Structure 1
């Protein structure tokens, strides 16, 4: 797929807001993901044991990881589609070491769109949401294609 420059602008315009509080947004997103699709929490040995949303919030570790996740995603979105290099090491670790099915990448994509919707309603109207969804679909499709090359597809 290919986003137009106007869609990329709508995506980097909300993203700039997210960047004013990366650790806060990383936390909200990961907790939204775990509560909604709890089976995902099982992929994290590190976090597995967390039982409630209050324990998740208090975890410093979880918060550092959310900053790592958003920083890696932000660097991919800022490429505006030219992200092949950035995608390589990511696709290799998630397909070979962690073993994350494309399905789960669809669940976190949903968690990102819900949290931006909640926090940034004025900058995340229908068109901007359509543009973010397209950028994440682009990301998922390119990651799926790499997974295939690497021998995991799925």
Structure 2
């Protein structure tokens, strides 16, 4: 669980993400595919994007990042009572896209990195701790849904 103080820290930095969802999403994917190349392998349709400018100019990639961050945003605002939002996400990521939990970890590191790049004076130690705690809870809870659907994280 997270304290109410921790959730407020989570939602305060998320309101800043919300000022440019598209740009954060772009930055997170660029970080994630470079840091963990196997990650680009799963998002097949972006495999021809060989350059950062290419990635930034693709509206496909951009709308993709908005869709993902939108879902995560709706989840965080539930402050842990997110089973209703996690099931559909577990279903597609567990059975259709086949995304290991370790890739979720990779994505979380990307997110924390971009939050720090874009919002340093609003993403100090305690906001960092809280967001990590929020994303760790999401990863736990979606791992458990994954197993419910069969097969492992």
Q: Same fold (TM over 0.5)?
A: yes
Corresponding residue of 1:111:
110
Q: How far apart in 1 are the matches of 2:143 and 2:152?
A: 6
1:137 aligned partner: 136
- Describe the superposition over 1:88-126 as per-residue Cα deviations: whole angstroms up to 9, x where unpaired: 000010000000000000000000000000111111000
Q: Aligned-pair distance for 1:48?
A: 1.5
Q: CA deviation at 1:153?
A: 1.6
CA–CA separation in structure 2 for the residues paired with 1:8 and 1:131: 7
- CA contact 1:145–1:153 (8 Å) conserved in 2: no
Residue 49 of structure 1 and its aligned partner are, at CA, apart by 1.7
- Given that residues 42 and 48 in structure 1 are in contact (C-alpha distance below 8 angstroms), is that contact kept between their aligned partners in structure 2? yes
Could you list the per-position Cα deviations for residues 56-98 of structure 1 after superposition, in whole angstroms to 9, with x for gaps in the alignment? 1111110010000110000000000000000000001000000
> Between Structure 1 and Structure 2, how many residues are aligned?
153
Gaps of 5+ in 1: none
Gaps spanning 5+ residues in structure 2: where? none
CA deviation after TM superposition for structure 1 residue 40, in Å: 0.4
- Partners in 1 of 2:139 and 2:73 — Cα distance? 14
Q: TM-score under structure 2 normalisation?
A: 0.98
1:51 positional shift: 1.2
